[PDB]
Nucleic acid binder design. Structure first.
Ligand SMILES: [Mg+2]
Ligand SMILES: [Mg+2]
Ligand SMILES: [Mg+2]
Ligand SMILES: [Mg+2]
Ligand SMILES: [Mg+2]
Ligand SMILES: [Mg+2]
Ligand SMILES: [Mg+2]
Ligand SMILES: [Mg+2]
Ligand SMILES: [Mg+2]
Ligand SMILES: [Mg+2]
Ligand SMILES: [Mg+2]
Ligand SMILES: [Mg+2]
Ligand SMILES: [Mg+2]
Ligand SMILES: [Mg+2]
Ligand SMILES: [Mg+2]
Ligand SMILES: [Mg+2]
Ligand SMILES: [Mg+2]
Ligand SMILES: [Mg+2]
Ligand SMILES: [Mg+2]
Ligand SMILES: [Mg+2]
Ligand SMILES: [Mg+2]
Ligand SMILES: [Mg+2]
Ligand SMILES: [Mg+2]
Ligand SMILES: [Mg+2]
Ligand SMILES: [Mg+2]
Ligand SMILES: [Mg+2]
Ligand SMILES: [Mg+2]
Ligand SMILES: [Mg+2]
Ligand SMILES: [Mg+2]
Ligand SMILES: [Mg+2]
Ligand SMILES: [Mg+2]
Ligand SMILES: [Mg+2]
Ligand SMILES: [Mg+2]
Ligand SMILES: [Mg+2]
Ligand SMILES: [Mg+2]
Ligand SMILES: [Mg+2]
Ligand SMILES: [Mg+2]
Ligand SMILES: [Mg+2]
Ligand SMILES: [Mg+2]
Ligand SMILES: [Mg+2]
Ligand SMILES: [Mg+2]
Lengths: 155, 114, 68
RNA sequence: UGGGAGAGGGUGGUGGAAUUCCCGGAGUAGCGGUGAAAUGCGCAGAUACCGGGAGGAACGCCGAUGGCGAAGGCAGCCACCUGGUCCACCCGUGACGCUGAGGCGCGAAAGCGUGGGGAGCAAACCGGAUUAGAUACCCGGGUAGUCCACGCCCUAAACGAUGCGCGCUAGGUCUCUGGGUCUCCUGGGGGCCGAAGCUAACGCGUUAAGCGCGCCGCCUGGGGAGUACGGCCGCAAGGCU
């Protein structure tokens, strides 16, 4: 907005692992405000991921996000008769916002049939380093570096 | 093969050239914007000079170059950043000098400089 | 850091006083104005012509490279 | 009489930086150009570098709210020829003065003629782009012309849109150049704000657009039109009235 710096909504940490991060993800899961539904497919996916990976999946998705955290994206700046994909040091709040938006985005991409299935499977790969979830980031951070000629136009 | 030499930075609105010469002045290698793969105003960018200046230095030392005196001419936005990577390249950058040419009110320029 | 103070008596017309005259030419060989030389109007003018003549004899430069 | 400053004007010499091309060395895949691109130039070796040579034009910093000039206008350095102008001393002539229809001379740029010159730039012109179109604005080339000599041409936002000379009418701050006694005082120019006063207002105000005297030019609604006719000038384009 035009006034001052907007505020950051601090969420109510989840009721299972005691984390606000978890509380954040279910939201993206949560469609039509169906928290119970969303809260399920998550802790459900948290089950399949456990069975196929016997390490506390809390850490799993604690990892698979940093792997998703993009460090540099591009943003279009149209100085004069042209718009420049001026890349900028992505912001923290946004990075979580960015990582929190393709896993599901890439999970919903996934072909397997059940919700908790997909959501989980995207959780693992990023913990390893595989999947379109890492794709966006990967593609994003290098187009920027593929445009490192505009950093002086930064902001 | 030569260890000490020179480096000239022709810095212009539309581009930036980096040519490296022997102590006598005989060029030994050169490079500029497009050589790294840019076409157009994107050439008129510092980061171009970087790769440009860099790619020229990299190729230079491959012939044994390790020291070069610097020479800059022009008023280009890609000028200084070129002087940068050269120092942050791998050469001793023994000196810097601006021999940018300027008349004393001689020939008339084009219409767009009046 | 005005210069006129840096010196005392001295001929504005000694068009051969290189060591002195060359004192008013910035390290880029250019002539230096008055907010930098402390010279006055009539003074200032009487200089250059002095410098110039030498700059023609081969004493002072018309310009100089720059070092950083 | 004695001085002073100054791109005042004219002739002849002359000094360095840069652009363009030629020659030589080295060197490689692009240079150039734009808001972005393209024409264009480049493996027949360009761009950026070094070295040498030829030619033309304009004189960077100094330089500036500066200076000189009646005006247009004048800017590297040198010398010669020459003009106007200012200050002081208050030496000489003793009203010899101001203005000035006519006349005459000067007159930036473009343009004309003749003979040179021709690097950069650059009307017309060709090309490439933007556009619905683009006979244009931007880009790549490019002819006259811009430069010199001698002739014309005589117009303009030739402006301070303010004719010239003189006398009278608070000052303040800045700057150029003089004289003094050197704090400062006085002459002459260049700007600024402002006394009173003027002015339709904006504004001017010891550089008047203020109070006055003299003389010249000039205006009398707009357009038609600075056109037609005649006359003069001119090689012509066109000028004057
Ligand atoms: Mg370019
Ligand atoms: Mg030509
Ligand atoms: Mg050659
Ligand atoms: Mg050369
Ligand atoms: Mg100037
Ligand atoms: Mg003036
Ligand atoms: Mg007497
Ligand atoms: Mg008598
Ligand atoms: Mg008269
Ligand atoms: Mg004339
Ligand atoms: Mg002319
Ligand atoms: Mg003719
Ligand atoms: Mg003829
Ligand atoms: Mg001719
Ligand atoms: Mg020609
Ligand atoms: Mg043109
Ligand atoms: Mg048509
Ligand atoms: Mg067309
Ligand atoms: Mg055309
Ligand atoms: Mg041209
Ligand atoms: Mg002709
Ligand atoms: Mg003609
Ligand atoms: Mg002509
Ligand atoms: Mg002619
Ligand atoms: Mg007349
Ligand atoms: Mg004027
Ligand atoms: Mg006047
Ligand atoms: Mg008039
Ligand atoms: Mg009157
Ligand atoms: Mg004095
Ligand atoms: Mg005065
Ligand atoms: Mg006033
Ligand atoms: Mg009043
Ligand atoms: Mg009246
Ligand atoms: Mg006056
Ligand atoms: Mg008159
Ligand atoms: Mg009528
Ligand atoms: Mg009428
Ligand atoms: Mg007329
Ligand atoms: Mg007639
Ligand atoms: Mg007529």
């Amino acid at each position: 907005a035009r006034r001052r710096r907007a505020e950051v909504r601090q969420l109510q940490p989840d009721l299972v692992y005691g984390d606000v991060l978890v509380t954040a993800f279910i939201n993206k899961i949560m469609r039509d405000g169906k928290k119970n539904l969303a809260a399920r497919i998550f802790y459900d996916a948290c089950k399949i991921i456990q069975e196929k990976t016997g390490q506390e999946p809390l850490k799993v998705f604690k990892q698979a996000v940093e792997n998703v955290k993009p460090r540099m994206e591009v943003r279009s700046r149209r100085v004069g008769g042209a718009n420049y994909q001026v890349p900028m040091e992505v912001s923290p709040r946004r990075q979580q916002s960015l990582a929190l938006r393709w896993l599901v985005q890439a999970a919903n991409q996934r072909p397997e049939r059940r919700a908790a299935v997909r959501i989980a499977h995207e959780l693992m790969d990023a913990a390893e380093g595989k999947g379109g979830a890492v794709k966006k980031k990967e593609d994003v951070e290098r187009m920027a570096e593929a445009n490192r000629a505009y950093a002086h136009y930064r902001w | 093969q030569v260890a000490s030499g020179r480096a000239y930075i022709h810095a212009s609105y539309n581009n930036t050239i980096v040519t490296i010469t022997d102590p006598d002045g005989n060029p030994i290698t050169w490079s500029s914007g497009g050589v790294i793969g840019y076409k157009g105003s994107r050439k008129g960018t510092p980061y171009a000079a970087q790769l440009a200046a860099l790619d020229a230095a990299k190729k230079a030392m491959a012939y044994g170059m390790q020291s070069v005196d610097v020479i800059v001419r022009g008023t280009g936005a890609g000028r200084e950043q070129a002087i940068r990577a050269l120092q942050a390249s791998g050469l001793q950058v023994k000196s810097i000098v601006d021999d940018t040419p300027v008349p004393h009110n001689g020939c008339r320029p084009k219409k767009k400089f009046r | 850091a005005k210069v006129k103070a840096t010196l005392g008596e001295f001929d504005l017309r000694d068009y051969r006083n290189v060591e002195v005259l060359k004192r008013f030419l910035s390290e880029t060989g250019k002539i230096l104005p008055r907010r930098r030389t402390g010279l006055s109007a009539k003074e200032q003018r009487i200089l250059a012509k002095t410098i110039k003549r030498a700059r023609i004899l081969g004493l002072l430069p018309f310009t100089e490279k720059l070092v950083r």
